C-alpha cells in the first residue's frame, strides 16, 4: 500500500484527451514528483533514472492502484487511461507468472511508450513489445519526435498512436507543410485506426487541426487536472 511513496511523493494529474468534437475520450496519467520531505519538485527523468527494477514495478503499481481506484468512473464514462510503460516493468509483466494479471482485468488501462523505448526500431522483432501487444492496448505517445522509425507502427503493435507536439506544430507553423500531416495520417490509418494529435496548444492550432479529423487531440487548450478532479472534465 506504500509503493514508492517512501522514496518520492507522486503528485498526480490527468491530461485530458478529447475527440475532434472536444468530447472526453481518455486521460494520460502524469506525475509531478517531489522529494520525500516535499521540499523540492524533482524532474521525472531524474526520478526514473534512479529506480531499481523492483522500484520501477512499485511506481507502476502505485499508478495502477490509482487508476483501479477510478475504475467505476472510467467504465461509466467509457474512457481510456494511459499509464507509462518502462522496459523494466515490461520484463516483469512477461517473465513472472503473476504480474500480468491485475493490469489485464482493467482493459481501459493502456500501456504508453515513447520513441525512446529500447529497440523500438525492431518493430515486431522486439520480443517484449510484440508479446505485450498481443494482449494489452499499447500506445505510442510521441510519433514524429524523430527518435525512431515507424517500423513498430507498420508492424501493427499499437492500438493508438499520438503525433508529437513538435511534429504537429512544425507542420502548422510552416503552413506549406500541412499536407505532410495528411500524408502521414493516411499511411498510418490502416495499421492503426486511432491517430491522436498532440500539441493542440492554441486556438489557431485547433482551428488548423480540426479538418484533419483525428480521432482525438491533446494539448494546452485542455490543461492537466489533479486526479481527484477528473469529474470536472465530463458533463455535470
Author numbering: 2 to 237
Which passages does the manuscript contain on this structure?
The YdiV structure was solved using selenium single-wavelength anomalous diffraction at 1.9 Å resolution. The final model of YdiV contains two protein molecules (Mol A and Mol B) per asymmetric unit. The YdiV monomer consists of 10 α-helices, 8 β-strands and 2 short 310 helices, which exhibits a modified TIM-like barrel fold. Although YdiV shares low-sequence identities with other EAL domain proteins (below 20% for the full length), the topology of the structures is the same. Particularly, the α8-helix of YdiV, which is essential for dimerization in other EAL structures, undergoes dramatic transformation. Notably, although YdiV loses most of the residues coordinating with c-di-GMP, a similar groove that is responsible for c-di-GMP binding in other EAL structures is still retained. Electron density map clearly shows the existence of a phosphate and a glycerol molecule in this groove. The interaction style of YdiV’s Mol A and Mol B is completely different from other dimerized EAL structures, such as Blrp1, YkuI, TBD1265, LapD and FimX. The Mol A and Mol B’s α8-helices, whose corresponding helices mediates the dimerization in Blrp1, YkuI, LapD and TBD1265 structures, are far away from each other. The interaction interface between the two monomers is also smaller than that of the standard EAL protein dimers.
